[PDB]
């Protein structure tokens, strides 16, 4: 294990994109040889100007493939005019595996329409077998995925300079035994009957809410004892360590509350800390009381992830209890789920 | 079972239809009227817009089918001028026959005004002959289920994730907005005259010194009234900064004196921070003043650097005027200068 | 329904790439119905091994309403006069699906075309005309 | 030429660096086989991000150039990630005008660090004899036109 005096770190950008392409009723390939089934342009966020697409020859490209259904990759749009990549194929069965996973080891040169794809891909008789599993429910389940290389970018670090070195950011590290140690605050702050002392300039700077409550003439005469019963000591101890400290240690055993009491007090980062903390906790059987509190705590990206999941497995949320009091006490939550399921991934009878 | 992200699926839902139609009297047909045989058309698809029609001609309409009976599939007109539709026709088992009729394993494209079919399908003395048992009660019944195949673009879906943002801590910044805003100001800092307004308990938090100052039972008095005279005003105003954010923005060009100050308040990162941009400054001419300067403020780190800084430019240091001063001031400065040039290196021959 | 197109590359002697790439133009169409969207695909060189010293021309569709369509395409060189020269058609009518390029692969020897007595690449520039009809 | 309804003039960009480099006392080159002299960085004013250079061994790169000068194109610094370009070299003579010009068809992907370049550039014999003058007072000129490839676009201008 040496020591560098000076190091260096050079990355090369590699960005992903995946495709799904499935072909119904496949056997009516509708054509003869020279048959070219395109597939819809496809992307992702970055820098969603590379747009792609996926040409398929059924029968063949050439006299040679005849026996051989041939996959191309085409880039259709591309902002520059090189772009190198990596592409790799391949065919789900009936339980979803690959199957005749073949890769690209070069990374070829790419240019606005240009197709570079394996002609001899699969055998037309190993796919039309139907013990193979190839084609289940005559669907012809292809696979793709693409990795692109950009220029890559030195970093050019160097160790062993400025002699003398800073200690970090103290702040916090002594402000988290500032709450703990309850030390030179003034008012009172009581929660389900238990107290606590915190001062006002914290949870002022910290929270628009208490900065409205203390202002309101209310610190001339009343500073001492303050009206929460809302919330529990449990999760409030919790609520101060995050405003005096800014970090949130015991997020998850208490996400629910903690989301509630943010959506009270109008803490945008905690109420985004307990979104990703319970959205980490998004499974089948508690969908139905995560939808209630997101749409109750207004919630915008919780709510996105919920119906999101909610319309991916819709298949086996229903069933439970959850779906069966959610529609008698929440007939607009019902209508909301309607409306993003019968839009996205089943429109109009495509795909049934 | 990988996941991917679009979800093309190329939905190429087929439309299919059902019919009823009786044909009487299919075995003297033919000497009762011949060849040309016309039936009623139907319509259907959707909303009935679409045009079909179905018969049977008992005998060939040329000379050269006379032998093979037709089903001809007429098509007047037709849904699109793309339709690949492999026609599959059926019986819904009359008797038994699904197989030796003719069903169609290559089709035509349909197009508007033309008519495609097929006009060979049994053996006309061989559907004749009732041995082979194919005359139930001398009627058939058509269920013509068109197929049509053509139809299948697109649909899609993004189908995106993306986690969820996660932005930073800001306490630093929001401290720094509330030394700003001075809200709820606790006690009242002087310094050259000039007020300022601060918070007990951050300072407490930060600087040891100011938290042993509100500890030694003078607070009836000393919590508004403290009184900071040996500091500047900007120095007092950078080190507020620094307590507050935890940052010193304009460190660089005011080093010496914000170090003082640090050393005064007991400011560890702060010490070490002018340090460092002190550390990074050096010349030959002032050399032996930052080395004062560091041992008057027992910045080791600082005094390390600036004596050994001197012992490698030593040639031009003693030239100076404060290295000649720094004799006469601070004897065991150099005192040091020699035990750091001689215990710390040698030997060198001689 | 009759297209037609002027396609120019310019500096083609720096051809820029080997055997076997191609050079697209950008999608064109007539006014009505601006619907069916095609594009030339031409490779500098040969885009068989075969082929190799030959020009290889195609007429892609990308962009249909319709499921196929029925073209005849008639692709020309214009040269330094400006006049149709190597002029030759497709006389069957092709069929065109989503996605489907035809053509001619064997359409001009390439040592025929860097002929400079030929005047068929005036100034370093070649001006392809392309006239489809569609029924 | 008929008027189309609509066009599209395809433009290519190309730029042009040319470099003119003078070596004095070039017999003095003082090393053997394996030597490279470099010339000062030079750009041409815009983008003035690539930054090029030429590289000269005097005797030769290897075993077969003994008797052949070796001339390389290097360039230093590039912030794209790959550069195509042709290079044409020339050495000038007594009265100044080019000869033994010769130059590169096939344009070379240029990167970080990466030269091309001719290692048979001229007979050394051939250089270093007095009658065919291609050494003027000791002296050896070197005239590097030099063609920098770009990105191609399309204008897609539309007519009546």
Known sequence: ????????????????????????????????????????????????????????????????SKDYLSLYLLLVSCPKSEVRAKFKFSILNAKGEETKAMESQRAYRFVQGKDWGFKKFIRRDFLLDEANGLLPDDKLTLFCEVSVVQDSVNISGQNTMNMVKVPECRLADELGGLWENSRFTDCCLCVAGQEFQAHKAILAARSPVFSAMFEHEMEESKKNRVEINDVEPEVFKEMMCFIYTGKAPNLDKMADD???????????????????????????????????????????????????????????????????????????????????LASAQCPFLGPP
């Open 1 to 64: 294990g040496p020591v560098a005096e000076s190091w260096c770190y050079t990355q090369i950008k590699v960005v992903k994109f995946s495709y799904m392409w499935t072909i119904n009723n496949f056997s009516f390939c509708r054509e003869e040889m020279g048959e070219v089934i395109k597939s819809s342009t496809f992307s992702s966020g970055a820098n969603d100007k590379l747009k792609w697409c996926l040409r398929v020859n059924p029968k063949g490209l050439d006299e040679e």
């Open 258 to 340: 903690l989301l509630a009491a943010a959506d009270k007090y109008a803490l945008e980062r905690l109420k985004v800390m307990c979104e990703d903390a319970l959205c980490s906790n998004l499974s089948v059987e508690n969908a139905a009381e995560i939808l209630i509190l997101a749409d109750l705590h207004s919630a915008d990206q919780l709510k996105t992830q919920a119906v999101d999941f909610i319309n991916y497995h819709a298949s086996d949320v229903l069933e439970t209890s959850g779906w069966k009091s959610m529609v008698v006490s929440h007939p607009h939550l019902v209508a909301e789920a309607y409306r993003s």
